Every structure is written in C-alpha cells, then in structure tokens.
A paper describes a structure:
The sMaf proteins share a characteristic Tyr residue in the basic region (Tyr64 of MafG), while CNC family and AP-1 proteins have Ala (Ala510 of human Nrf2) at the corresponding position. Interestingly, when this Ala residue of mouse Nrf2 (Ala502) was replaced with Tyr, the resulting mouse Nrf2(A502Y)-sMaf heterodimer preferentially bound MARE-like sequences with dG-dC dinucleotides located on both sides of the TRE core in vitro and in vivo. These results suggest that the identity of the amino acid at this position is a critical determinant of the differential sequence specificities between CNC family and sMaf proteins. To gain insight into such specificity switching by the Ala/Tyr replacement, we solved the 2.3-Å crystal structure of the complex containing CsMBE2, MafG, and the Nrf2 A510Y mutant and compared the recognition mechanisms of the base pairs located on both sides of the TRE core (dA4-dT4* and dG12-dC12*) by wild type and A510Y Nrf2, as well as that by MafG. On the other hand, dC12* is directly hydrogen bonded with MafG Asn61 (corresponding to Nrf2 Asn507), accounting for the dC specificity of the sMaf proteins. The bulky side chain of Tyr64 is located close to dC12*. Thus, if dC12* were replaced with purine, there would be no space for a water molecule to mediate the hydrogen bonds between Asn61 and the purine N7 atom. In fact, in the crystal structure of the human Nrf2(A510Y)-MafG heterodimer bound with CsMBE2 (containing dG4 next to the TRE core), no water molecule is observed bridging the dG4 N7 atom and Nrf2 Asn507. Thus, the bulky Tyr at this position of Nrf2(A510Y) and possibly its equivalents in sMaf proteins are incompatible with water-mediated purine recognition by Nrf2 Asn507.
Nuclear factor erythroid 2-like factor (Nrf2/NFE2L2) is a member of the CNC family and plays a central role in cellular defense mechanisms against oxidative and electrophilic stresses. Stabilized Nrf2 then translocates to the nucleus and forms heterodimers with sMaf proteins, thereby functioning as a transcriptional activator and upregulating the target genes involved in anti-stress responses. In this study, we report the crystal structures of Nrf2/NFE2L2, a CNC family protein regulating anti-stress transcriptional responses, in a complex with MafG and CsMBE. The co-crystal structures of Nrf2–MafG-CsMBE complexes show that the CNC motif stabilizes the conformation of Arg residues in the basic region in contact with DNA phosphates.
Numbering used by the authors:
A (entry chain B): 454 to 558
B (entry chain A): 24 to 122
Amino acid sequence: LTRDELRAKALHIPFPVEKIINLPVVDFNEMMSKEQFNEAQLALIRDIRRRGKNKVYAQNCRKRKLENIVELEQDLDHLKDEKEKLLKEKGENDKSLHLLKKQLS
Amino acid sequence: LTDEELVTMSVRELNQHLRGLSKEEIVQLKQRRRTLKNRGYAASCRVKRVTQKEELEKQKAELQQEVEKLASENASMKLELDALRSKYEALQTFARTVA
DNA sequence: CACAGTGACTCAGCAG
DNA sequence: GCTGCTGAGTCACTGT
C-alpha cells in the first residue's frame, strides 16, 4: 500500500487514491458530493489530488525539455543541408551567368 | 558553520571540525553537507542544460537567417539570369535571319 | 475557483 | 566510505 493510500485510509476517506487523482473535475465533484468530510479529510484529499496531478506535469515538462533538444538538433541538421544545397544552386547560377557574360564580353 | 563554508570544506578538513560534536551530530552535519552538495549538483545540471539550449537556439537563428537570405538572393539572381538568357536567345534567332 | 506548467530543492540510487 | 550525476517527487509559484 502506498503512503497516500495509507494516509487516506487513516482519515477514513472511502475513495480510491486513483480516482482522487485521475477523475475529471466534473466526475471528481460528483464523487465528493453527498459527503460530510471534515477539514482534515478535505485537506488530505486536495493534497493527494494536487500532488498526483503535479507529478505528471513535471514528468511531461521534463519529457518536453528532452524532446525540444532533439528537435533543435534536427533543425540544425536540416538547415546545414539546406545551406549546402542553396550554395550549390548559387554556384550553378554563378557559373551560368559567367558563361553567358564570357560568350558576350 | 555557514552554508558555502561547509560545502567548500574538504572531507579531510571536515574531520578537523569535530570539536565537541557527538556521534549523531557528526552524522547530521555530514548529511547537511551532502544535501548542500546535492543542491549544487542540481543547480550545476540546470545551468548546463540552459546554456546548451540557448546555444543550440543561437545557432538555429543564425543558420535560419543565412538560409533565408541565401534563398532570397538566389531567386533574385535566377530572375536576372533568366532575363539575360531570354535576350541572348532572342538575339540568337534574329542572327539566324541574315543574308 | 479550476487545471497546467516550471525553477528550485530534495532524496534515492547508480557509477566511478 | 565520498563524489557527480540524474530520474523523480514536491513546493511555491505563475500562466490560461
């Protein structure tokens, strides 16, 4: 049993910790309805929900940081290729303009 | 003992500051130093990731404006090259109409 | 109010 | 044993 589940059981909270954290706010409010929790039970429920949701936010925030570095390194890779491709095109245009001007003077 | 003074202290000099401390207070002070060291490692890690991100973004912005400028000037020169080739070809066909 | 995001701090645990 | 690093959880905020 997790520490959260033991604390919820100690305060006689009848809801599963998973439902406290993962229920959409509409269904969460329905679950909380028709109850009689004291301040201690309400505070622990709110603490479990906040920590459970913020845990995932931090997870997603750290995954995005790593993904953003991968996307940046890919952007650099393509830009160097596009710069190389554009320079080749500029060379063929510069060589064609030269040949034309040579043909004339 | 203030914070950074305990962090900068080597493990050898730390044992020189065991004046009147009990076996437990020596432990808690060692965990206090370790906590302060871990706080610096996380800050050192956060700084390293920030400079890496800011440097990669600096190179991307520079290369993006390089590529954008290259594509723009290439398109403008290709216009003038095509126009010069058109006049050259038009003069070519007229040159084939002589006695 | 709600949810979502984020720098900083913390601890755990692995490698050296 | 300590040292650096780093994946997570948490807090105290700010943002929509």
